[PDB]
């Protein structure tokens, strides 16, 4: 139907579960995109819902630090998602490669992540799954935009509505309120931002334990610290921002707007 009529397929850029990503061109526009081609026949009822909600939620977001979903087409047994062409790979991969970021690079990175999160929150969306694996670099070039991706676990919220939206996310980045089965909302994204920022600076997470029971106990207790000597030379304002993000009471936790006005960021 409309995908074949408007888009021209080029080379494979990546593969997922029941999905291939190819470079494509909107023929009449002459602009290149990443076309995610999904075999809908292979998807479970659960997977179908997550595709539907991803297609709806990503499409209502428009921000330079969010991977833009330009189009969503359903044909005979194939779903097509047209995204921004992003060739820099995952923030996760860049952190593994570089080991850690300078305060200047960490601040620049988290600034772009908070702008993306602020946009989501203003548009009435909670991502629920912020992690370096779900953040992509626009290109290989230094200073290339960081873009938020994979809205498969994203929810719509009405203003400052708190509700039990279910147990969802990535263990290491899960907020205390989700672990506590509490009604939750926008703040869960800011906790994940704290975990990401911690990782950016020293290249290991504030909460890790092979024993998940211990891991979840530590998160709920806010039992993180700044080990020596790596943290000894990190500025107090950097640690202050992490502390305000890793606040176990989501009501007392710094917002995306507030975080962007923090001395260590100063973007708003």
């Amino acid at each position: 139907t409309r995908f074949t009529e408007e888009y021209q397929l080029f080379e494979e850029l990546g593969k997922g579960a029941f999905s291939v990503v190819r470079r494509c061109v909107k023929v009449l526009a002459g602009q290149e995109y990443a076309a995610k081609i999904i075999n809908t026949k292979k998807l479970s009822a659960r997977d179908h819902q997550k595709l539907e909600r991803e297609a709806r939620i990503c499409r209502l977001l428009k921000h330079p630090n969010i991977v833009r979903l330009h189009d969503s087409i359903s044909e005979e047994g194939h779903h097509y998602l047209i995204f921004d062409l992003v060739t820099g790979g995952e923030l996760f991969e860049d952190i593994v490669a570089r080991e850690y970021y300078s305060e200047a690079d960490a601040s620049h990175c988290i600034q772009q992540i908070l702008e993306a999160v602020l946009h989501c929150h203003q548009m009435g969306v909670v991502h629920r799954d912020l992690k370096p694996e779900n953040l992509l670099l626009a290109s290989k070039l230094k200073g290339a935009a960081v873009k938020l991706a994979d809205f498969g676990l994203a929810i719509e919220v009405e203003g400052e509505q708190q509700a039990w939206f279910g147990f969802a996310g990535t263990p290491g980045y899960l907020s205390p309120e989700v672990l506590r089965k509490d009604p939750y909302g926008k703040p869960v994204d800011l906790w994940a931002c704290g975990v990401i920022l911690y990782i950016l600076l020293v290249g290991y997470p504030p909460f890790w334990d092979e024993d998940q029971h211990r891991l979840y106990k530590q998160i709920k207790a806010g039992a993180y610290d700044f080990p020596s000597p790596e943290w000894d030379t990190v500025t107090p304002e950097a640690k202050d921002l992490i502390n305000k993000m890793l606040t176990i009471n989501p009501s007392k936790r710094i917002t995306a707007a507030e975080a962007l006005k923090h001395p260590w960021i100063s973007h708003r």
């Binding site: 659960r46 996760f92 992690k131 694996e133 996310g169 290249g203």
Partner: peptide, 13 residues
């Protein structure tokens, strides 16, 4: 620093 996977429900690991 290890890759971590997204869950849509609680599972005790």
């Amino acid at each position: 620093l290890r890759r971590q996977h997204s869950y849509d429900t609680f599972v005790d690991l």
